[PDB]
Ligand binder design. Structure first.
Ligand SMILES: NC(=O)c1ccc[n+]([C@@H]2O[C@H](COP(=O)([O-])OP(=O)(O)OC[C@H]3O[C@@H](n4cnc5c(N)ncnc54)[C@H](O)[C@@H]3O)[C@@H](O)[C@H]2O)c1
Ligand SMILES: NC(=O)c1ccc[n+]([C@@H]2O[C@H](COP(=O)([O-])OP(=O)(O)OC[C@H]3O[C@@H](n4cnc5c(N)ncnc54)[C@H](O)[C@@H]3O)[C@@H](O)[C@H]2O)c1
Ligand SMILES: NC(=O)c1ccc[n+]([C@@H]2O[C@H](COP(=O)([O-])OP(=O)(O)OC[C@H]3O[C@@H](n4cnc5c(N)ncnc54)[C@H](O)[C@@H]3O)[C@@H](O)[C@H]2O)c1
Ligand SMILES: NC(=O)c1ccc[n+]([C@@H]2O[C@H](COP(=O)([O-])OP(=O)(O)OC[C@H]3O[C@@H](n4cnc5c(N)ncnc54)[C@H](O)[C@@H]3O)[C@@H](O)[C@H]2O)c1
Ligand SMILES: O=C([O-])C(=O)[O-]
Ligand SMILES: O=C([O-])C(=O)[O-]
Ligand SMILES: O=C([O-])C(=O)[O-]
Ligand SMILES: O=C([O-])C(=O)[O-]
Lengths: 329, 326, 329, 326
C-alpha cells in the first residue's frame, strides 16, 4: 500500500478571483491537488467545496482543500502561486487606477508569505502574481531565499497574450500562430515589441507591405496592449482581470511541473542580461523542470532600448524605496 | 471565400459569476464562439476582453464578445444558457437563504428572455440555470414557445456531482467511476438515490457488506448533498456556487452540440412520466443533437416515492405561485 | 540548474503495433518520455523518429527514443508496458486462432523480460499485455519479483470496452455512460456480466422492461464481446487489434502515474478474493499511485460463479502446465 | 426527434497505416464520425471495430464504420482525407526509394477518387496525402472539380514538424515554441527556410550569436529535414512514416472544421504566387471554415530562390509526366 506516484501539489496563496480561477484550471485538467489559502475565513472553504464538485462533473480526480495556516497550505507544495494582496486602492477613482499605488499595501504581505515558504517549502517553484509585479517578485525572492531560478513573476505572458489576440484579430488568424511579446515591467512602461511580431515566424512587416495591416493599426494595438489592464478595471467596476491572468500563471506552472521547456516571457532574475544585475524584470525565458532554465537576450534597437531603459530605471527606483521601507521584522 | 464550416455559437444571457465561467470553459476548450449579455453596462465588455485574452494564452481561437441588445446576443445562437437573475433576497440573512424566495424577483426576467428567444432564435437549444430552477424552466418554456425537447434546466448534474464527490471520497476512487444520481426539484426536497449508487456499475450494497462504507455514512452523504448549495452560500458570504454549476451547464451544452448522447439528469418536460404532465422536474435524461432524446422513469422504493412526491409538491406549488403572478 | 521536476518515463518493451501505438498516445497527450525497445533492430528507431515528429505537430514536448539494451530501456522507468511476443502461430488458419497456442512461444520472452525488470527497475509498475494474458502476468510476476500490487495485466478494460460499445449502440447512449464489465481470463472463458450492466448506474433491467433492448440481444452482445478479438484477427488478415488495447493499457498507466484511483478491471493478484489464491485473473480493481490499491469482490450468482469457475479452473491448468514445463534456469 | 446538431463526418479514403491512424485521432478526440474505405476488403471492418472499441475506452462517442462503396463512404463527408495508393515500388531496393516513382501507380487511383468526390460530395474539403503529393493534389483538383480553396495537400506541416523537432532539440525548448517552415515540393527538393526560423518570434540569428546553435548545425538540421521520410523508410523496412503524417492531416482538417484559422504550410492552388499558375505547391496558408483562406508569399533571398526553383522544376516535371499518362 506504499504510495509510489504522488500527485503534484500547487498552493494558491490568495484565494480571491485569480486564486480560485487557477484552482478551477487545476481541477478541470487534473493537473494537481490544490490548496486554497486566504486570510479571509470561510470563503476559501466554499470555493474548495465548489471546485471539488467540479472534479465529478468533468470526471477528474484531484483533491481541492482550503487550509487556514501557512504550514498546512505550504508543506509539500511543488509550486506556490501568490495572488494575495489588494487590486485597487480604496477610495481612488477607477480613472486613476495605478498598479504602483499598491506598493505600500502589498509589500508586507508578499514579504510575509516569502518568510513562510522559506520555512515550509524551500524547494518549491514560486510564481508571483500580486501587483506591482516586478517589485513584488524581488521582495518574494529576498524573503523566501530560494535559488533565483526557482522564482519568477507572471505578467508578460498576459500582456503578450493580449498583444497576440489583437494582432490575431487584425490578421484573421489563430492566436496560436501569432508570436508577439511584451518585455519590461508590468505597467505603463511595458514594451510591446511591434518590430518582433511574427505570424508563424513570418515578419509582420511583410503583412504591412502587402496591405493587410497598417503601421498605425499596429501602433494602436501596442497602445491597447499597454492599457488593457486598466480597460478591464474600468469596465468591471469592481476588481481587475482574472481569467487570463490565471490561465497564464497555470501555463507557466505546467511548463515547470511537466518540464516542457516552453518559451514564456515572465519577470525573471537578471545576472548581466541586457546589462542588469540583482533585479527581476519581464523578459523571454525558458521554463522547465529546473525552473527558469534560460533568460533570452533580444537585440533591441535604439527606440526599444530607450523604452526598456525607462522601465528599468523606474523599477530600480521602486525597488530601492521598498528596501528602504522594509520592516526590520 | 464562402464560409462552409461555421463555429457553434453559445449565448450566455446573464454574465455574472456563472455566465462568465461558462464563457471561460468555451474559450479554454475552443467549444464555440461566446456572446456575453447582461443588464449591467460595462461588466460584460470587461469579461469578454479578459476571455478573448485567454484564447491567446491557451492557443485556441473562438470569438468572445459582449452584446447589449437581445437581438445581437440571441441571433444565430445554437444554444442559449440563462443565468440572469438574483442569487439571494436583498437584506435577508444567510441562514435564511432559500431558492424559493427568488421566485418574485426572477420570474419576470426569465419570461422576458424567453419572449426574446421566441423572436430571435426559436430553433435554439435552451439551458436554464436561474433559480428556482424547475419553476423557471417552465416559465421559459411557456414564454419561448420552443419544442419541449429543446429546453431543459441544469441542476441535477450539479447535485449529482456533489453526491458523487462525497461517495468518491468515502470509497477512495475517482468520481469518474461513481454513478450517483439526484432526481426531483433542485431544492431542500431533492432526492439523492442512495439505492442506485454504483461503483463502475457495481452495486454500492456489496461495498457496504465489505465494510468500505456504512449505511449511516451513505445517509449522511445524501443529507450533505441536499444542503451543499446552502453550505457554499454560507461559506462564501456573497453569492453562490459557480464553478461546478458552469461546468455542469457546459457539459450539457456540449452533449447537444456534439450529439454525444450522454445520460445526464436535468430538469425536463414531463409527458406523463410518474403521472406528471405539463411541468418540468429533474429526471435522468439523454442529451443529443435532437435535444432531450430520452427521459428515464426509474422504479422508486417507498422512501424515494415519498421524497419524490414532496419534490413534485414543491414544484407544483411554485408553478401555482408564478401563475398567480404571470 | 538541477532538475527538480522530472518527466514520467514509460518503457514499451515490444515496439510492434501496440507498443508504437501506446508511444503515440504518450506523445499526443504529453504523458511521459517514451522508450521503445524491441529485438528487431531498425524498426524501433524509425517509429521513435516518427513519434518525435508528432510532438512538434501537436505542440507537446516529450522525448521518444529507441533503446537497444534492456539496461538502457528499463533504467528509470516509472511504468513498463510489455507487448513483446507473437500474436499468431505461423502457418495456422485464422479460423483456428487461439491465444493459448501462443503459450509456448511467449512464456520464455515474458520470463526473460521479468528477469531484466528485476535487475534494472525493480520499483516499476508493470502492465503486461502479451497473450495469453492471465498466464503471462503470473510468469512476469514470478520472474520480476516485484510486489504483487505493482503488476497487473491489461485485458478486461478492453473486453469491457467492447461490451460497452455494443451496449451503447443498442441503447443509443454514449459509452461513457455504460458500465458493463467482463471478468475472468482473457479468452473464450471470459465472463461478460450481463446482469450487472448499468446505464449511469441505472440497471439494464429497466431498459429491458421499457422495451429498448431484450435479454436475447444482450446475450448476443456478450457472445460478440467474447469473440471480438478473433473477429478482428480474421478481418485484418495479419496481426490483431491494437488501437483499443493500446488506449486501455495507457489509461491504466495514467491512473497509476496520476494516482487517479480509477476502477478498472484488469488481471490482478488474488490472495483470497472469490476464494482464489496465488494467481492472477481479470477482476475489477482500483489503480492508484500505490499500484493496485483494491481488488473488488462482486457478489456473483449461481450461474455467474459457474462461468467464472470455468475460467478459474482453466487458467489454473495452464499455469500448472507452464510451471511444469519451465526451465529450472 | 429531429436532429438539429449533427456530428461532423470525415471519410478516410484509404485505410492503411495513415488512414487508420487518423481514424484513431478522430475517435480519441471525439472530433467526428469516421468512415474507413479501402480496396482491400475485411481490413477496414477490422480497424473500424478496433476504433469503435476505443471510444468506450476513452469515453467519447463517435461512430466509426467501414464502407464498401464510394457512395456510402463519401456521401455527407464534411472532409475527405485521401491516403489511397502505394508507399514504395514493389521489388525496388530501399536505398532507391523515391516518392516520384510512385506516380504511375497512384495517379489513376487519385483520379478515380476525385471523380467520385465530384459525384457524391462536391462540397467537401479535400486533404490529399498520397505521394508524390503536390502532383497528386493537381490530379485530384482536375478530377474532382471542387472550388480551388477547398482542396490542399498535407506535407509541409509534416516536413516543418520534423524541422521544428530538430531545432527544438538543439535549443532545448518545446517545439510548440519553434516556428520553422519548409516550403516547396514534398521531396528531396523541399526548402527548409533556415532564415525564417524563430523561437517564439525571436530571430534564430541571435541564438547563433549567443552560441546556442551554430550556423553549420542549422544547415545540417535543414538537410536532416529533407531526408527524414527516407530515413524512416529505411529504419522501418516496410512501409513509411504514419504517426506524424496522420497528426498533420487531422490538424489541418480540425482547423477547417472548427474554423481555427491556423497558419499551416500545405500544398495549395497557385493563382500567381512566384509566377506559379494552374498547379499546387507547398506554401504557408491559413486554413479556416472557408478552406484555404490566404496563401502567404514570403520574400526569398538568393539561395532560397535557387532552392525553390528546383522544387518548382521537380513538380512541374511530374505534372508534365502525369499529363502524358492520362
Ligand atoms: N501580474 C499580473 O499580470 C496581474 C494581473 C491581474 C491582477 N494582478 C494582481 O493579482 C492580485 C490578486 O488579484 P485578484 O483578482 O485575485 O484579487 P482579489 O481581491 O480577488 O483577491 C486577492 C485575495 O488576497 C487575499 N489577501 C489579502 N491579504 C492577504 C494576506 N495577508 N494573506 C493571504 N491572502 C490575503 C484577499 O483576502 C483576497 O481573497 C492583485 O494584487 C492584482 O492587482 C496581477
Ligand atoms: N440550477 C442550479 O444548479 C444553480 C446553481 C447555482 C446558482 N443558480 C442560480 O443561477 C443564477 C445566476 O447565479 P450567478 O452566480 O451567476 O449570479 P450573479 O449574481 O453573479 O449573476 C446574475 C447576473 O444576471 C444579471 N441579470 C439580472 N437581471 C437580468 C436581466 N433581466 N437580463 C440579463 N441579465 C440579468 C445580473 O446583472 C448579474 O450579472 C441565480 O439565479 C442562482 O441562484 C442555479
Ligand atoms: N491482453 C490483451 O488484451 C491483448 C490485446 C491484443 C493483443 N495482445 C497481445 O499483445 C502482444 C503484442 O501485440 P502486437 O499487435 O503489438 O504485436 P506485434 O507483432 O505487432 O509486435 C510484437 C512485437 O514484440 C517483438 N518481440 C518479439 N520477441 C521479443 C523479445 N524477445 N523482446 C522484445 N521484443 C520482442 C516483436 O519483434 C514485435 O515487434 C501479442 O502477444 C498479442 O496477442 C493482448
Ligand atoms: N504527404 C505526405 O507527407 C506523406 C507522408 C507519408 C506517406 N505518404 C503517402 O501516403 C500514402 C499512404 O501511406 P500509408 O502509410 O497509409 O500506406 P499503406 O500502404 O498503409 O496504405 C495505403 C492504402 O491504400 C489502399 N489502396 C490502394 N489502392 C487503392 C484504391 N484504388 N482505392 C482505395 N484504397 C486503395 C491500400 O490497399 C492500402 O490499404 C502513400 O502514397 C504514402 O507514400 C504521404
Ligand atoms: O495587472 C493587471 O490588473 C492586469 O494587467 O490585468
Ligand atoms: O442553487 C444553488 O445555489 C446551488 O445548488 O449551488
Ligand atoms: O487478445 C486479443 O488479440 C484481443 O482481444 O484483441
Ligand atoms: O512522404 C513520406 O513518406 C514522408 O515524408 O514521410
Amino acid at each position: 500500500p506504499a504510495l509510489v506516484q504522488r500527485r503534484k501539489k500547487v498552493a494558491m496563496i490568495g484565494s480571491g478571483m485569480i486564486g480560485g480561477t487557477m484552482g478551477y484550471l487545476c481541477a478541470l485538467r487534473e493537473l494537481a491537488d490544490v490548496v486554497l489559502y486566504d486570510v479571509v475565513k470561510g470563503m476559501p472553504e466554499g470555493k474548495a467545496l465548489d471546485l471539488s464538485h467540479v472534479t465529478s462533473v468533468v470526471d477528474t480526480n484531484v483533491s481541492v482543500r482550503a487550509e487556514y495556516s501557512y504550514e498546512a497550505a505550504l508543506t509539500g507544495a511543488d509550486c506556490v502561486i501568490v495572488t494575495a494582496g489588494l487590486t485597487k486602492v480604496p477610495g481612488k477613482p477607477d480613472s486613476e487606477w495605478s498598479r504602483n499605488d499598491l506598493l505600500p499595501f502589498n509589500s508586507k504581505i508578499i514579504r510575509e508569505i516569502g518568510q513562510n515558504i522559506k520555512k515550509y517549502c524551500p524547494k518549491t517553484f514560486i510564481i508571483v502574481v500580486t501587483n506591482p509585479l516586478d517589485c513584488m517578485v524581488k521582495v518574494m525572492c529576498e524573503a523566501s531565499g530560494v535559488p533565483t531560478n526557482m522564482i519568477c513573476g507572471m505578467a508578460c505572458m498576459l500582456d503578450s497574450g493580449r498583444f497576440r489576440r489583437y494582432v490575431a484579430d487584425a490578421l484573421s488568424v489563430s492566436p496560436r500562430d501569432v508570436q508577439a511579446t511584451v518585455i519590461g515591467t508590468h505597467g505603463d512602461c511595458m514594451v510591446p515589441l511591434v518590430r518582433y511580431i511574427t505570424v508563424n515566424g513570418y515578419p509582420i512587416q511583410k503583412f504591412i507591405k502587402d496591405g493587410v495591416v497598417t503601421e498605425k493599426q499596429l501602433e494602436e494595438i501596442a497602445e491597447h496592449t499597454k492599457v488593457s489592464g486598466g480597460e478591464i478595471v474600468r469596465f468591471l467596476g469592481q476588481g481587475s482581470a482574472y481569467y487570463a491572468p490565471a490561465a497564464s500563471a497555470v501555463a507557466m506552472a505546467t511548463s515547470f511541473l511537466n518540464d516542457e521547456k516552453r518559451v514564456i516571457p515572465c519577470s525573471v532574475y537578471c545576472n548581466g542580461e541586457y546589462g542588469l544585475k540583482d533585479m527581476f524584470i519581464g523578459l523571454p525565458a525558458v521554463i522547465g523542470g529546473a525552473g527558469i532554465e534560460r533568460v533570452i537576450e533580444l537585440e533591441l534597437n535604439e527606440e526599444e532600448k530607450k523604452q526598456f531603459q525607462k522601465s528599468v530605471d523606474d523599477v530600480m527606483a521602486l525597488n530601492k524605496a521598498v528596501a528602504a521601507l522594509q520592516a526590520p521584522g
